[model samples]
Target: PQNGSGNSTSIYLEPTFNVPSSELYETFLDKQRILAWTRSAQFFNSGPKLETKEKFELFGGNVISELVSCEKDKKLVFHWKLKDWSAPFNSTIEMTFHESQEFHETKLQVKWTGIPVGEEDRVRANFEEYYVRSIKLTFGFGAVL
Candidate 1:
């Protein structure tokens, strides 16, 4: 069931949510807004304000565990760990938020890739499911729509 050549399984994910681009653009994408969301959502008890000195001091932990890292206005990455299943899956979640000059919508495309071989064996089937949840949850579609 390989899509192309050899036997390495890969999934190209694309999820589109009609976010209130103008309404939440500054809040959702801005670092300050990020701080607000983290505190309100309290994702995994990561209550540190994004602006406080403590926020900058911590290098790795993120409120949304899925969003392992983020380069504001650029990119956000997701990492998942299946501790209960002992899957220990790890991958990169990439997103490109596209906004139109005159249109009323902002489009975001997501891609999940780079699963190390060590994780492929156990979590292969659940990758897509996890990816979908990560995209929907990380992007704050829960509150938007």
Candidate 2:
């Protein structure tokens, strides 16, 4: 209402990781590692066998996703959806990994677009609490990242 549009979920999000950037990036394509980190996500892509535009499943079929693009260990873009939530179209989730070679860490910045206007806050919290926090704790990064 305030933004004059109710079909946007544009948000800038970032999560820090206390691991080598490359290793952190690889988790996107490592099914086993994905499984180990994801709480609400029960399935992922073909892991190391990823392909652009390939369909990926998750959360016991709660979400439908596709790999829109990938740049090895640097960036990844996905077309994601929660069929029962907003409906009709897929949203974009772009993840970029910046390496801090000096610190041996990675900062993952996520840009999620096309979310139903009013759901921005909830979606952001979902990633922060359920996804980011889970990964941080699981990898001994505590709750800082």
Candidate 3:
């Protein structure tokens, strides 16, 4: 079931949360807060903590990722791929944060790109199940998941 965009895939999601950007930014930056909402409220033993060039296992070891960029309270980017997938089409996930005009509101935009060729549907399916079904709900974004 290709959507006609053969070999390339990108998924974008933007959602607002009932919290200030500063607070939300910290959540993304702080490992403690991040652990508070992981798939099962678990922790990430980020040995070196979080920063560019760091590597760690997440989602209970199902995902192994390398941190590619960390931009203050504005964004966090990761070069990640499933343990089962090889090079050439690993995904890149970028999450950007913005403070809304309204007080205590933060807009979070997430983008997932470079999914493996011929496995877009499969990758998307898992993302829907894991990221949407689990992580989104855990993060408390509420409606769009």
How would you encode candidate 3's per-residue C-alpha lDDT over 1-145 as one tens digit per residue?
7444436578777655655666666665456655655543223444424666766666776676677888877887888777667645568888788877756566678888977667667766766666544534666644552
Q: Stretches of candidate 2 above 4 Å error? A: 1-6, 39-48, 141-145
- Per-residue CA lDDT of model 2 for 19-131, tens digit only, reads 77667776676666666767445444434555777776666777777887898788899887876665555689999888787877778899889787767787788888766
Superposing every Cα of model 1 onto the true structure, what RMSD results? 8.7
- Model 3 TM-score is 0.68
What C-alpha RMSD separates each model from the true structure?
8.7, 3.8, 5.3
Write the residue-wise lDDT of candidate 1 on 18-104 in tens digits. Answer: 455443334433454554434333333344323211222111332223555555444555553333322334445566667555654
Name the weakest run of 10 consecutive residues (lDDT summed) in model 2.
39-48
Where does candidate 3 have its weakest 10-residue lDDT segment?
39-48
What Cα-based lDDT does every candidate model obtain? 0.44, 0.73, 0.65
TM-scores for every predicted model: 0.44, 0.81, 0.68
In candidate 1, stretches whose alpha carbon ends up further than 4 angstroms from where it belongs are 1-8, 20-66, 84-88, 114-145
Backbone clashes, candidate 3: 0
User: What lDDT would candidate 1 get against the real structure?
Assistant: 0.44
Q: How many clashes (backbone N, Cα, C below 3 Å) per candidate? A: 0, 1, 0
